[PDB]
Symmetry: D2
Subunit: 255 residues, 4 copies
Amino acid sequence: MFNSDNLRLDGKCAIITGAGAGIGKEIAITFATAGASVVVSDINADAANHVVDEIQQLGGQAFACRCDITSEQELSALADFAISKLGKVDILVNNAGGGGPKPFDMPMADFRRAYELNVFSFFHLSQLVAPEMEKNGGGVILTITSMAAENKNINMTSYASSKAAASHLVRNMAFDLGEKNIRVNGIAPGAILTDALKSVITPEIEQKMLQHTPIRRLGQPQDIANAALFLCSPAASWVSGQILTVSGGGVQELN
Amino acid sequence: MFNSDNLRLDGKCAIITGAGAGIGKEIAITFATAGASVVVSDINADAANHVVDEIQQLGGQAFACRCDITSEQELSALADFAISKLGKVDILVNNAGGGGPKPFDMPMADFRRAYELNVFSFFHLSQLVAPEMEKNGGGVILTITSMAAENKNINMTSYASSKAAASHLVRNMAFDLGEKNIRVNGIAPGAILTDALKSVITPEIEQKMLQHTPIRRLGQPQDIANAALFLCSPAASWVSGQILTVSGGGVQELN
Amino acid sequence: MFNSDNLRLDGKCAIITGAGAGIGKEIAITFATAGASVVVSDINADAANHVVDEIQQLGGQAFACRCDITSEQELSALADFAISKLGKVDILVNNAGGGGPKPFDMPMADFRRAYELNVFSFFHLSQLVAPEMEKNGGGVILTITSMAAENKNINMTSYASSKAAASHLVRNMAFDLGEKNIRVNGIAPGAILTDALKSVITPEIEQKMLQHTPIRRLGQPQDIANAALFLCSPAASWVSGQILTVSGGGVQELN
Amino acid sequence: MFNSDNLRLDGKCAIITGAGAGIGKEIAITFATAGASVVVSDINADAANHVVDEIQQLGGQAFACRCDITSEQELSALADFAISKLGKVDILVNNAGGGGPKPFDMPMADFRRAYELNVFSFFHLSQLVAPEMEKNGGGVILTITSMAAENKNINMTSYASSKAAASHLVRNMAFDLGEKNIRVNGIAPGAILTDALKSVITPEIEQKMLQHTPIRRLGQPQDIANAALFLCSPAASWVSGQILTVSGGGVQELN
Ligand SMILES: NC(=O)C1=CN([C@@H]2O[C@H](COP(=O)(O)OP(=O)(O)OC[C@H]3O[C@@H](n4cnc5c(N)ncnc54)[C@H](O)[C@@H]3O)[C@@H](O)[C@H]2O)C=CC1
Ligand SMILES: NC(=O)C1=CN([C@@H]2O[C@H](COP(=O)(O)OP(=O)(O)OC[C@H]3O[C@@H](n4cnc5c(N)ncnc54)[C@H](O)[C@@H]3O)[C@@H](O)[C@H]2O)C=CC1
Ligand SMILES: NC(=O)C1=CN([C@@H]2O[C@H](COP(=O)(O)OP(=O)(O)OC[C@H]3O[C@@H](n4cnc5c(N)ncnc54)[C@H](O)[C@@H]3O)[C@@H](O)[C@H]2O)C=CC1
Ligand SMILES: NC(=O)C1=CN([C@@H]2O[C@H](COP(=O)(O)OP(=O)(O)OC[C@H]3O[C@@H](n4cnc5c(N)ncnc54)[C@H](O)[C@@H]3O)[C@@H](O)[C@H]2O)C=CC1
């Protein structure tokens, strides 16, 4: 029997990483707007504060944090800030990441940054949060991975390998955290219409993309926010260790 | 931003196969309860009708039909009836199927049966239903596949390969139909506490199953129903060609 | 330590299906030429006889059979012919199959033929052969599946779903047959330069193909024959339930 | 037609990491015995030198080098030495790696270590070696990955995700390098009877492992060596981006 309250986050406290823009922002708004008290972490503090305002006008409860996911020290801080403002953490939404297209001969420092962004931060923040969740009797961690973790193409060595590590960590973390009654899932988005996408997309690339997408349209952040809501809601209580690909049933690549 | 109406099925018409018991019955109820008019199909008309009464008790619109999915004559009948009672078709939830464990030396008749129940029936009904949806401007086809489509084990030649063919149909069919604005997805459930499982499970197998499930509890029909609602709802508008697995982050196998 | 005799089929008897042309032919020649006595089954008897001649001049041992894989009755016959001519069967190479691109609204008879060709024949011949292999203490079955079993595109519903069932049967048959000390593997070829490929390939399609293939070249039957030799040789004695994709590291599609 | 010369490595130059024992030692021997001049690298120079003597005893060309793959300074040294002794590089068999089972609460230092051993080292050496190969007109890079790259279980966060990143590198790297005519592949072995396994295995775990292996015997170094020879030979010329799994058709896990 359908029950609208099971698709809502009433009384849940969520840390949302890289929430000042794009997919991240929409998840924050969609979550707070579904009953969750949200902490908005972003490196661009201005963006982070704007979202909080947006949420508050909407009748939401939000706090801002100027964290850089790529800093162990700023991570444990964000984690402390969250428990202080919220009181507890129930949902971790690891959205921040990145890296992008890089040539085979890129410097190893470039190769390494994608792992800091996409794997190490995600895993370390999970470590910092899990103990709280366990203490409350359960929680949910969701990471925004990528379809690059499944695709094969040129100039994607760093990005694609890092997101693959991110998606597989998910399948395995689901075991270690399952004992603590924590669920871990990820969403793998396709061509989402974001500034991030705009910086690397050419008018022809877009077209090639659209012609390989059955549902002829480019993704909007809400598509990802809608899926994040479901995966983090009590309606998905027996869903763990999964990666949901939101891509119109197609494939969108640059090369 | 969270919009509750996108998670409901108001004014949609759904045909559901094998909805007399287990998983299908709950999808039927959850859907009718979420605003859809449903056609409860099953090879057991008594069961089909009982589900119909319950839906009506809950205040929903529903019609019962006795259809054996393994007959093309019976599938057309099912499509016709659905149309004459509903006036249109917006959603197909192809749930009936089965086959189960079988020795390698099984008669070809038993091997082929698995395909009749899980592949040919499902493909053909989509052929029947597609044109109706197409004219309404789109629709959603959903199939209840299986973890066996990915697992490997002894005594599963017929069952596992057929479910694997069904899961790959979803991926390709998503292309042919993306043009008619029809989305196609599937759900592969783990051990769901239903009589089909109760028929093959034992206390030892039971324990071994829970022994490998991170979220330590067997699945409930509602879990599948919850996922089916999201997948068939407006909120999953850009999700096509996917097979979502509901297994508590683990695997439940017989061996 | 390398040992050339481990990559040879000296004293092995192999049934090669659809061996009168393309990939099939090359496997026959490459096998007989590596020490195996070969039975050449094909529906085009003339082609089947030509290959036998070719093999004999080369100093090979071969027999022809005019079998249609899509006939239970011709299958048990082929199996009997093989044991009579060869004395025993050690290697089953299920190469015959087919079907090709079909539209969503194809007749169900067309949908069903791909399964006869790609799944049912393969599974039934395996049943007919396994008992011999068991009797000898072991054997190897190899099927030629396809990359369509992994790819998603339009007009591939029947072909792609059937080959997927074929590839997954492999993963599972490896269990049932493993007790009998039988190994089951498959090879999934990409754009192999065959008349079969020529009938559905356009000059532009070819180019698109080549530009998505890292090893810029189209496959030759020998590539598949070389891989079949390894998979069926004693050097691969602990390799079972695998599908080796030979595709220059790329993807080759029509749509 | 079968051509034995295509299965040999005559006049090729191969660098092999961690070749002092186990799997790497056997690849070294098999390769030198198949006609290649090899550079036995290992963090244990005694071991490296012992392998060199054996290869020379068997009549092959080989050189020992003490390299700890987790140091960029040491990898360049390894590439330089290989070139000054061999004159060119035709094959890279990146075998050294490791990490193993680790609790979820492990220090980030241990999590990151897994990446140093399985991902960064391997990617960087390919950067070093690629230009050498490129000039000879092509080459082959092969990595010894793992089944953990696909399995899911408890205590494998660091180990499994890193191997998963390495396996996906192979898939993408195959693209960047397909142009230089370099092929990239990997082998994911099951339980191979080597001391690394002997360090983690127990008689009970032993039994459970064989309990799920169709071809009921633990793997031997030669099995991996046999597959590596084929993959790095002229016979696999159109095989790139693949990860071949040698596991006897089953899975050997610790839990
Ligand atoms: N836009 C697209 O097409 C797709 C994006 N993704 C993934 O989605 C995630 C984010 O996507 P978008 O919203 O498009 O990105 P975006 O770049 O538009 O916005 C991300 C937000 O993250 C913040 N940020 C960046 N680095 C940070 C750091 N080191 N520490 C803390 N905050 C940081 C930025 O200030 C920004 O406000 C990434 O993990 C990306 O890999 C995956 C598939 C598609
Ligand atoms: N419960 C479980 O453990 C799992 C079930 N499944 C799948 O869920 C689907 C439904 O199974 P459950 O609800 O568990 O089983 P169930 O046996 O409890 O219910 C099946 C319903 O379908 C009807 N049905 C059977 N054959 C039919 C036919 N030939 N034509 C029309 N209707 C027919 C039955 O009469 C019954 O009412 C199947 O596709 C099965 O493969 C997949 C994974 C797990
Ligand atoms: N050519 C290509 O690009 C690729 C082919 N494949 C697969 O390889 C297999 C064969 O490929 P090709 O050698 O290119 O085909 P082909 O059509 O060139 O030759 C196949 C041989 O099979 C025979 N044959 C057809 N139906 C038969 C039947 N019903 N019973 C007995 N014999 C029959 C034909 O007479 C012919 O001599 C098929 O399973 C196909 O799905 C997979 C990937 C690529
Ligand atoms: N034997 C098994 O059960 C399996 C092993 N593997 C993989 O096979 C590869 C090799 O392992 P085995 O032969 O089994 O192990 P092993 O422990 O028997 O041999 C490893 C060799 O690599 C050397 N080595 C270790 N660290 C090194 C470093 N930091 N730099 C340079 N050389 C180093 C060791 O001294 C030793 O000589 C690894 O990538 C491992 O992940 C994968 C699956 C199974």
